[PDB]
């Protein structure tokens, strides 16, 4: 399927512009020390944020999951790079789709309170092993791990159909009243 690189390289002998140039170095700096060197969920989390407590692995592990879905357990240079443009540089609304996918842990085309508790739960383990404990209790009235889920579901939804489709979430994630800040997690810093 597809190829071993971008369509540009396939046709064009060396593409052009400072575009590929930037990638030429990336593709080389990574494959230079290893011909046909592919990345792995482990080599990624490491060569990227190489954390320590590891706890902050659930979050990243998700990234590779939502992005690396080909089903080969491996992620070639191409895939990775694609993610960058989707995050590194300015990110357009295209995020509404990719993010909606991050939650899709069961792969079915529909999101359910099951996926909500899954991802959020992950975001919790992250902010937990971070530089703060946000002492759930004394900190602004804590809640149950299932509460937040029922909060993002009800708000994003409204018909009570019992199913959170893309369009439903997309529009419910385009602005809402708090879905962004939360689901966003990073925000900017």
Return residues touching Ca ion (CB under 5 A).
Answer: 68, 70, 72, 75, 104, 106, 108, 111, 157, 159, 161, 163, 168
- According to DSSP, residue 140 is labeled T
Shortest distance, CB of residue 70 to Ca ion, whole angstroms?
A: 3
Residues preceding chain discontinuities in the chain with C to N over 2.5 Å = none
- Ligand-binding site membership of 159 (annotated): yes
Closer residue to Ca ion (CB): 72 or 147: 72
Contact at 8 Å (CB) between 75 and 38?
yes
CA angle 142, 185, 161 (to 5 degrees): 75
Contacts of 99 (CB under 8 A, 6+ apart): 173, 183
SS3 (DSSP) at 19: helix
Shortest distance, CB of residue 13 to Ca ion, whole angstroms?
A: 26
Shortest distance, CB of residue 125 to Ca ion, whole angstroms?
A: 20
Binding site feature residues for Ca(2+): 68, 70, 72, 74, 79, 104, 106, 108, 110, 115, 157, 159, 161, 163, 168
Binding site feature residues: 68, 70, 72, 74, 79, 104, 106, 108, 110, 115, 157, 159, 161, 163, 168
């Amino acid at each position: 399927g597809q190829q071993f690189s971008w369509e540009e390289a396939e046709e064009n002998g060396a593409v052009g512009a400072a575009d590929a140039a930037q990638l030429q170095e990336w593709y080389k700096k990574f494959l230079e020390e290893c011909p046909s060197g592919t990345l792995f969920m482990h080599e990624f989390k490491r060569f990227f944020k190489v954390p320590d407590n590891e706890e902050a692995t659930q979050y990243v592990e998700a990234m590779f999951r939502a992005f690396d879905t080909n089903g080969d357990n491996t992620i070639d240079f191409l895939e990775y790079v694609a993610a960058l443009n989707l995050v590194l540089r300015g990110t357009l609304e295209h995020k509404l789709k990719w993010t909606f996918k991050i939650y899709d842990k069961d792969r079915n085309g529909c999101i359910d309170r099951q996926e909500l508790l899954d991802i959020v739960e992950s975001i919790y383990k992250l902010k937990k092993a971070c530089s703060v404990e946000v002492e759930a209790e004394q900190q602004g009235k804590l809640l149950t791990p299932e509460e937040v889920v029922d909060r993002i579901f009800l708000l994003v939804d409204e018909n009570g159909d019992g199913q959170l489709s893309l369009n439903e979430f997309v529009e419910g994630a385009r602005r809402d009243k708090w879905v962004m800040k939360m689901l966003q997690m990073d925000l900017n810093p």
